[PDB]
Design a protein around this ligand. Sequence first.
Ligand SMILES: NC(=[NH2+])c1ccc2[nH]c(-c3cc([C@@H](CC(=O)[O-])C(=O)[O-])cc(Br)c3[O-])nc2c1
Ligand SMILES: [Ca+2]
Ligand SMILES: [Cl-]
Length: 223
Amino acid sequence: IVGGYTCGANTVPYQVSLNSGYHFCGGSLINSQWVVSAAHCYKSGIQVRLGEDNINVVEGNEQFISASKSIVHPSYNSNTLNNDIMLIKLKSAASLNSRVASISLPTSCASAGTQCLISGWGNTKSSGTSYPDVLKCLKAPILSDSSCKSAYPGQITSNMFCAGYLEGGKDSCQGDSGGPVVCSGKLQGIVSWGSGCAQKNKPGVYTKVCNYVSWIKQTIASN
Ligand SMILES: NC(=[NH2+])c1ccc2[nH]c(-c3cc([C@@H](CC(=O)[O-])C(=O)[O-])cc(Br)c3[O-])nc2c1
Ligand SMILES: [Ca+2]
Ligand SMILES: [Cl-]
């Protein structure tokens, strides 16, 4: 997260860290056994780390659970990143409490101007790499579809939306992929891509979760 602030320990209880010997992507806990992340974060050997604040120190509240299976959306296109969503089923259910809790899926899509909270352990530099130990937060609004398409002509599908600041300076970045975009207590987006990080007129692009609620429910119901 570039231009964000320290969230504060366990103030984002649905945030998870996907780990393979190091933190490589974020995710959101949606129930005690399932996590939603981005398809481009897929790899084998994933350990899901819940209740984290400092990812380099065991401070208490952490729950490390292996993923039993990862389900990348069948229509995921790695070239366009269209349908960049994946579901991860945990080997055992997580113990939910105040520090580890699930986030609700939306019942409707959000409008432009909605303010959302984006969090993660991704790079904090737009020009260089600096990875933080604790979780960073950023409040960002959803932009209009016209501003988004104007910024990324020909690259935005109906399953994506832009959120951020056209002036640059505040944005999600590499390492934040797969993490949550929460607006009014509902998971509306998944950190997906962007051109560089926090560049002027190049806002972040997110997977539009409201387009996938039935798919998520049907897939969880059959696995
Ligand atoms: N500007 C943003 N809002 C943004 C958001 C998520 C991103 N995720 C990534 C991302 C980038 C890589 C690098 C690979 C590298 O430099 O080593 C790449 O360009 O392909 C890899 C992953 Br996986 C990302 O999620 N860039 C991102 C940029
Ligand atoms: Ca820790
Ligand atoms: Cl277009």
